[PDB]
Design a protein around this ligand. Sequence first.
Ligand SMILES: O=C(O)COc1ccc(Cl)cc1Cl
Ligand SMILES: O=C(O)COc1ccc(Cl)cc1Cl
Lengths: 135, 135
Amino acid sequence: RFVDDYLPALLAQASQLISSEFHEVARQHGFSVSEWRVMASLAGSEPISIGQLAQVTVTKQPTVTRLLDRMEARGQVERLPHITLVRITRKGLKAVEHLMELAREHERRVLEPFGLRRAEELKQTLRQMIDLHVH
Amino acid sequence: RFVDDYLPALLAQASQLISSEFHEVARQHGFSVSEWRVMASLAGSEPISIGQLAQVTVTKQPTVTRLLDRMEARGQVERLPHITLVRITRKGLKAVEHLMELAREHERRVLEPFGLRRAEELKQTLRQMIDLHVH
Ligand SMILES: O=C(O)COc1ccc(Cl)cc1Cl
Ligand SMILES: O=C(O)COc1ccc(Cl)cc1Cl
């Protein structure tokens, strides 16, 4: 059966199942999916361009720009001129840091049955595939 | 940097990049993303329930039901009573079979740099993760 062993279907299914688990936690802490992705990807980061943020959050750039409008109004991010750069503020970092700890715990739980070797292999393969296909 | 080594972000990014590549081909052959997922997941399948189809196509069930309304009007799928089951028709199979060959070729190209061992390891890990987290 094709779908059972077709890589893009496996990636899409695994991604949605794991993400859906953590999105429940994120919402219980006041975060939408997009807010979580933006703050977690900016935490501990130099300012990056709106285009880089859209890439790493897997979000269309027009959508990211409207999201940053409201996140900047809430004091959680700041846009700055170099192209437009964006950074997390201290308020945003304090808003997200506990949730990031919870995300690490959940990821640990997802990966523990597989063992350190298989978990690192998976992450390295995914990183290599991303770097080969990103524009 | 958190996002660089956080499994759900890696899965979401790799999934979107690989899928976006094949979706260009699919549209050039007349298929939307959802139409492609439905027909490719039903090809060579016993009839399955709408809920199973929603799961394997990573699509919300209300959306799948409206999609099947129009795909059934086009003669490409058929809904049948057991719960509602759904199957691909011969017309649908003939519509999608070439695109499935192209999808296999694209997947081969994505996986070839990694070698057979790493490619099979990735697919087995993804399958195991899906089976551990699906409801
Ligand atoms: O939403 C999810 O569960 C996975 O996607 C992400 C999660 C965290 C970050 Cl920082 C970036 C992305 Cl794309
Ligand atoms: O759309 C994509 O590129 C990947 O998602 C799929 C692809 C094919 C099938 Cl059959 C099922 C799914 Cl979820």
